[PDB]
Scaffold this active site. Sequence first.
Site, PDB file in Angstrom:
ATOM      1  N   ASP A  49      -1.038   0.452   8.039  1.00 56.44           N
ATOM      2  CA  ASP A  49       0.237  -0.168   8.459  1.00 56.44           C
ATOM      3  C   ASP A  49       1.405   0.165   7.290  1.00 56.44           C
ATOM      4  O   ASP A  49       0.955   0.500   6.258  1.00 56.44           O
ATOM      5  CB  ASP A  49       0.411  -1.473   8.934  1.00 56.44           C
ATOM      6  CG  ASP A  49      -0.224  -2.441   7.569  1.00 56.44           C
ATOM      7  OD1 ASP A  49      -0.028  -2.185   6.602  1.00 56.44           O
ATOM      8  OD2 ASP A  49      -0.810  -3.650   8.241  1.00 56.44           O
ATOM      9  N   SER A  80       0.944  -1.204   0.032  1.00 53.96           N
ATOM     10  CA  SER A  80       0.054  -0.095  -0.041  1.00 53.96           C
ATOM     11  C   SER A  80       0.848   1.217  -0.190  1.00 53.96           C
ATOM     12  O   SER A  80       0.659   1.891  -0.944  1.00 53.96           O
ATOM     13  CB  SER A  80      -0.855   0.203   1.276  1.00 53.96           C
ATOM     14  OG  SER A  80      -2.204  -0.766   1.001  1.00 53.96           O
ATOM     15  N   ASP A 117       4.570  -1.706   5.326  1.00 52.61           N
ATOM     16  CA  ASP A 117       5.329  -2.806   5.170  1.00 52.61           C
ATOM     17  C   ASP A 117       6.778  -2.568   4.616  1.00 52.61           C
ATOM     18  O   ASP A 117       6.954  -1.654   3.778  1.00 52.61           O
ATOM     19  CB  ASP A 117       4.637  -3.809   4.154  1.00 52.61           C
ATOM     20  CG  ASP A 117       3.185  -4.461   4.619  1.00 52.61           C
ATOM     21  OD1 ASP A 117       3.479  -5.048   5.387  1.00 52.61           O
ATOM     22  OD2 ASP A 117       2.363  -3.953   3.938  1.00 52.61           O
ATOM     23  N   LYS A 135      -9.939  -0.566  -4.518  1.00 52.82           N
ATOM     24  CA  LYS A 135      -9.548  -0.966  -3.059  1.00 52.82           C
ATOM     25  C   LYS A 135     -10.925  -0.565  -2.262  1.00 52.82           C
ATOM     26  O   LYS A 135     -11.429  -1.524  -1.497  1.00 52.82           O
ATOM     27  CB  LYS A 135      -8.316  -0.718  -2.509  1.00 52.82           C
ATOM     28  CG  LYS A 135      -7.159  -1.452  -3.169  1.00 52.82           C
ATOM     29  CD  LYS A 135      -6.081  -1.072  -2.687  1.00 52.82           C
ATOM     30  CE  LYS A 135      -5.565  -1.714  -1.397  1.00 52.82           C
ATOM     31  NZ  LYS A 135      -4.226  -1.392  -0.492  1.00 52.82           N
ATOM     32  N   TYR A 195     -12.930  -7.425   0.405  1.00 52.96           N
ATOM     33  CA  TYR A 195     -11.395  -7.401   0.711  1.00 52.96           C
ATOM     34  C   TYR A 195     -10.889  -7.973   1.852  1.00 52.96           C
ATOM     35  O   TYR A 195     -11.105  -7.923   2.825  1.00 52.96           O
ATOM     36  CB  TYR A 195     -11.114  -5.770   0.983  1.00 52.96           C
ATOM     37  CG  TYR A 195      -9.602  -5.426   0.978  1.00 52.96           C
ATOM     38  CD1 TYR A 195      -8.763  -5.623   1.717  1.00 52.96           C
ATOM     39  CD2 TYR A 195      -9.163  -4.652  -0.287  1.00 52.96           C
ATOM     40  CE1 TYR A 195      -7.560  -5.130   2.206  1.00 52.96           C
ATOM     41  CE2 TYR A 195      -7.981  -4.244  -0.112  1.00 52.96           C
ATOM     42  CZ  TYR A 195      -7.065  -4.502   0.932  1.00 52.96           C
ATOM     43  OH  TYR A 195      -5.722  -4.109   0.888  1.00 52.96           O
ATOM     44  N   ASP A 219       5.618  -3.469   9.731  1.00 51.15           N
ATOM     45  CA  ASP A 219       6.026  -4.870   9.700  1.00 51.15           C
ATOM     46  C   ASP A 219       7.193  -4.992   9.017  1.00 51.15           C
ATOM     47  O   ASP A 219       7.371  -4.887   7.561  1.00 51.15           O
ATOM     48  CB  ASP A 219       4.763  -5.475   8.777  1.00 51.15           C
ATOM     49  CG  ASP A 219       3.525  -5.895   9.571  1.00 51.15           C
ATOM     50  OD1 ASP A 219       3.021  -5.306  10.713  1.00 51.15           O
ATOM     51  OD2 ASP A 219       2.900  -6.838   9.200  1.00 51.15           O
TER      52      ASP A 219
HETATM   53  N1  LIG Z   1       1.226 -13.154  -2.874  1.00 53.42           N
HETATM   54  C1  LIG Z   1       2.321 -12.032  -2.376  1.00 53.42           C
HETATM   55  N2  LIG Z   1       3.256 -11.724  -3.123  1.00 53.42           N
HETATM   56  C2  LIG Z   1       4.143 -10.681  -2.924  1.00 53.42           C
HETATM   57  N3  LIG Z   1       3.953  -9.811  -2.037  1.00 53.42           N
HETATM   58  C3  LIG Z   1       2.975 -10.142  -1.023  1.00 53.42           C
HETATM   59  C4  LIG Z   1       1.930 -11.234  -1.500  1.00 53.42           C
HETATM   60  N4  LIG Z   1       0.958 -11.164  -0.451  1.00 53.42           N
HETATM   61  C5  LIG Z   1       1.197 -10.361   0.458  1.00 53.42           C
HETATM   62  N5  LIG Z   1       2.487  -9.427  -0.087  1.00 53.42           N
HETATM   63  C6  LIG Z   1       3.017  -8.100   0.739  1.00 53.42           C
HETATM   64  O1  LIG Z   1       3.032  -8.215   2.211  1.00 53.42           O
HETATM   65  C7  LIG Z   1       2.692  -6.940   2.516  1.00 53.42           C
HETATM   66  C8  LIG Z   1       1.347  -6.709   3.368  1.00 53.42           C
HETATM   67  O2  LIG Z   1       0.110  -7.280   2.560  1.00 53.42           O
HETATM   68  P1  LIG Z   1      -1.061  -6.386   2.458  1.00 53.42           P
HETATM   69  O3  LIG Z   1      -1.374  -5.672   3.716  1.00 53.42           O
HETATM   70  O4  LIG Z   1      -2.344  -7.526   2.198  1.00 53.42           O
HETATM   71  O5  LIG Z   1      -0.944  -5.548   1.003  1.00 53.42           O
HETATM   72  P2  LIG Z   1      -1.234  -3.957   1.066  1.00 53.42           P
HETATM   73  O6  LIG Z   1      -0.667  -3.605  -0.562  1.00 53.42           O
HETATM   74  O7  LIG Z   1       0.093  -3.569   1.818  1.00 53.42           O
HETATM   75  O8  LIG Z   1      -2.659  -3.374   1.440  1.00 53.42           O
HETATM   76  P3  LIG Z   1      -2.968  -2.886   2.795  1.00 53.42           P
HETATM   77  O9  LIG Z   1      -1.857  -2.621   3.782  1.00 53.42           O
HETATM   78  O10 LIG Z   1      -3.962  -4.307   3.325  1.00 53.42           O
HETATM   79  O11 LIG Z   1      -4.286  -1.850   2.603  1.00 53.42           O
HETATM   80  C9  LIG Z   1       2.648  -6.090   1.097  1.00 53.42           C
HETATM   81  C10 LIG Z   1       2.515  -6.864   0.249  1.00 53.42           C
HETATM   82  O12 LIG Z   1       3.012  -6.347  -1.045  1.00 53.42           O
HETATM   83 CA   LIG Z   2       0.036  -3.104   4.385  1.00 56.76          CA
END
Ligand SMILES: Nc1ncnc2c1ncn2[C@@H]1O[C@H](COP(=O)(O)OP(=O)(O)OP(=O)(O)O)C[C@H]1O
Ligand SMILES: [Ca+2]
Length: 467
Positions: free
Chosen positions: A96, A85, A98, A211, A220, A150
């Site tokens: 959060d 995100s 990442d 989203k 979602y 994270d």
């Molecule tokens: N299958 C995957 N392949 C590569 N990266 C992944 C996969 N699943 C999750 N991730 C990664 O781990 C991190 C956290 O997941 P996630 O929080 O669901 O996505 P996000 O794009 O940060 O959206 P949100 O923070 O939930 O709004 C960021 C994301 O890119």
């Molecule tokens: Ca995230």
Amino acid sequence: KHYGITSPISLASPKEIDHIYTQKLIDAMKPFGVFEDEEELNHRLVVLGKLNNLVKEWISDVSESKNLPPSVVATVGGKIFTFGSYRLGVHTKGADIDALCVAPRHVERSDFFQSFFEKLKHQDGIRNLRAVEDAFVPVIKFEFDGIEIDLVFARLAIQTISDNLDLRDDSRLRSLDIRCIRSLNGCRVTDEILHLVPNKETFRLTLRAVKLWAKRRGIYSNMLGFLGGVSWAMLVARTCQLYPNAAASTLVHKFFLVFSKWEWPNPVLLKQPEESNLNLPVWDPRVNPSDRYHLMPIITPAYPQQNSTYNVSTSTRTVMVEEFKQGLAVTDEILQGKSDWSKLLEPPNFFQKYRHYIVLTASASTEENHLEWVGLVESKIRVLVGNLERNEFITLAHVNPQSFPGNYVSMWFLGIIFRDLTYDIQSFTDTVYRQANNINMLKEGMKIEATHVKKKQLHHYLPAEIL
Ligand SMILES: Nc1ncnc2c1ncn2[C@@H]1O[C@H](COP(=O)(O)OP(=O)(O)OP(=O)(O)O)C[C@H]1O
Ligand SMILES: [Ca+2]
């Protein structure tokens, strides 16, 4: 030349009214908290600055427990990368972050989880520190001045960390611990998507909209068998490649057009996969019968390419396909001036569209007791669904991925379509405690209960949203 694996569907550019629809889109979106403030963005900027500096600090400290020449410890780098995100620039209020910590030769995965873990514990605004290294991607989670972070670690086999490093190189993966590789994957994917998109401004705006739509519409959640961030990011990116010139307004529409025609399980690919000498496990149904069964392949573009929607059962695929089509219908109206963006964003009639439900109630004694247990349960709901799908009489098991409150409690609701399920339920509740025991986790005061309820009887359980 163009972007994706296919030449695009249309090169049509927007006219004055398409700009009008885009502005209406932004305006419909603001009230939902999608766009963060100058203050907020900056706060993230300040927090991330510290984290980075800690990481540059700590990689220097460790580099002196190994006594390298002081004209090298200075040269020793260290860097923090973001992904997900926030890096996509589409995160919402309260999101959060990442992040990825990238160290040089002399820093072992062992170090990050003990010494740097000790470093964070001491820093001023850090709360909620906790390691989870058993997990699939080894992470340290915390809050830093109120930002959930994270933090994930990778050890490269180089001497320094050039402050302008570039993770997109496949040569890096050579001779790396599978732990280190899965850790690089986050950035690699995120950065790949941004590069495979013809217009970043329109991609972001469309992503924010989609989203929001997914959340509002109850699809979602990667956990509960729907889609998460990376999946939606990839679908919106594929749509962007097909219409390299559209406005977001058009892109949200085309998105629904595209992914309601889409013939599953044709996989969604953002680039032509190359092969390497690297020989790592890869999604490929043409060599893996297990892959043939994935219902909605959305394939990560960084090597090694994997599917991101393994969690998708048939019911969730079916529910989402209907939502896709609903989006197409409403956006047909919207781009004609006959309906407003709010109509796209209306919650679905989940608590009326089904004759039967399951109320999944989960209880605990104390707060720390609750949060943990709710964690465990929620991670097991996909199993009940599974049981229900294997039921002869059941046509659809629809979980609503929003928990509600009611001593500490939480509930989830499943909606069911038929063509007495107390023992599809028992085996589930039984399975949960049983596995809770396997991890010596189940503490007294932690109940989980699941009762079948007809629609007529739903209102006894319906919480506060009865409005
Ligand atoms: N299958 C995957 N392949 C590569 N990266 C992944 C996969 N699943 C999750 N991730 C990664 O781990 C991190 C956290 O997941 P996630 O929080 O669901 O996505 P996000 O794009 O940060 O959206 P949100 O923070 O939930 O709004 C960021 C994301 O890119
Ligand atoms: Ca995230």
